[PDB]
Design a protein around this ligand. Structure first.
Ligand code: NA
Ligand code: NA
Ligand code: NA
Lengths: 237, 237
């Protein structure tokens, strides 16, 4: 692990504070602007959709990325939520109600057992079974997110290979001739997250970032600051 | 099927001639600028890399998208070919020697049986087992490319689901907040190809295009013209 404080200028430039963690898979080396915060644990919020999806697929709660999760007829503030969804759109729009239903069907016992099998964060599901990742006891750090993602990337998690391939497909965020990003956003009213990885032709760079997010004003910063770090390190052009 | 000659404006504006074929999956309806050229069969060239990959995966000739195909040590004109590759980079840079090796390992008998099971084009693999898609007997039309691709999209081809998911991952070309394109380019001395699909939140649009390609100058037009048509049809912004 190497600390590079020069990344802090990207945060300063945006009147923000946070951590970016990068892992170079080929070199097995990590880099971050703040080693201490890199190892501090926070509520995952919607980044929890990654393990939740995996578990739901492995248990058959979700069949595949095409199955329709019918809208439950309750109108909610976020317009995109008020419609039918599949795994791809549910991830893309972070549709909380669909995942809450998943969590209820999974149940606390299977949920707790799976997170333990995954070595996921503090592995604590205390609170409501359908909301612990938003306001309950579970915590994970940026470095822990990287460890978890590395296992997912290599199909090493304790679910089927098929479930893992499907979730990586659903994580697809951006792709062009230069790179591919597979990732998940999250935010909880105190912290904003972006975790995932960048696929290059001959390497993979895992990333996990979080930042203080007093208002939702700055949500776009999660990707922007990360990309500035990626640009500075020449990972993307 | 519906003919839209207005699309010809995009070809002529580039001093070009060709066909674009679109299929709206939800509505089960197709659109083309030239109904007859849509059904004209040509050598598939590198678009054959899609069935070739599926077969190699299903037979274990390829383990997965990470397996290294070591460079055989012969230097060829295209700089990107002269290195080790995996399925992702082999597709991205259309690395013919790797696929030629796959074809030799698959062998004529299994190749022929699989293309028949695929209902692929004219199913004719004469003569050279490692070059028939470049100079041999096989011919496929833009509409036939679409039929094959629709089966691949739904995991309905007669190979494992896993094989189909891996090849679709390897087809990934472009992705953003508005769309995902999975596709494969091809070109022989005479014609250039682009075939694949556009994933939207609530629909999939299949496409297959081919155009006259007297020089390799114009290869960029395969994507550009196709995108102008997608833009016109309001499929992408
Ligand atoms: Na690793
Ligand atoms: Na910025
Ligand atoms: Na044009």
């Amino acid at each position: 692990w190497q600390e590079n404080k020069s990344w802090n200028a990207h945060f300063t430039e945006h009147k923000s504070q946070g951590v970016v963690v990068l892992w170079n898979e080929n070199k097995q080396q990590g880099f971050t602007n703040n080693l201490k915060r890199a190892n501090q644990a926070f509520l995952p919020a919607s980044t929890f959709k990654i393990p939740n999806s995996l578990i739901a697929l492995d248990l058959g709660v979700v069949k595949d990325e095409h199955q329709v999760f019918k809208w439950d007829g309750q109108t909610r503030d976020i317009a995109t939520w008020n419609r039918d969804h599949n795994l791809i759109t549910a991830m893309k729009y972070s549709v909380v109600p669909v995942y809450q239903e998943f969590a209820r069907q999974i149940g606390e016992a299977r949920m707790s057992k799976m997170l333990h099998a995954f070595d996921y964060g503090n592995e604590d599901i205390s609170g409501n079974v359908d909301s612990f990742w938003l306001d309950g006891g579970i915590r994970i750090s940026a470095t822990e997110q990287i460890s978890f993602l590395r296992k997912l990337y290599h199909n090493k998690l304790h679910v089927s290979e098929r479930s893992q391939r499907i979730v990586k497909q659903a994580m697809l965020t951006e792709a062009n001739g230069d790179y591919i990003i597979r990732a998940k956003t999250g935010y909880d009213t105190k912290i904003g997250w972006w975790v995932g990885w960048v696929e290059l032709d001959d390497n993979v760079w895992f990333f996990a970032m979080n930042m203080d997010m007093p208002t939702s004003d700055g949500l776009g910063l999660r990707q922007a600051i990360t990309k500035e770090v990626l640009k500075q390190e020449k990972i993307i052009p």
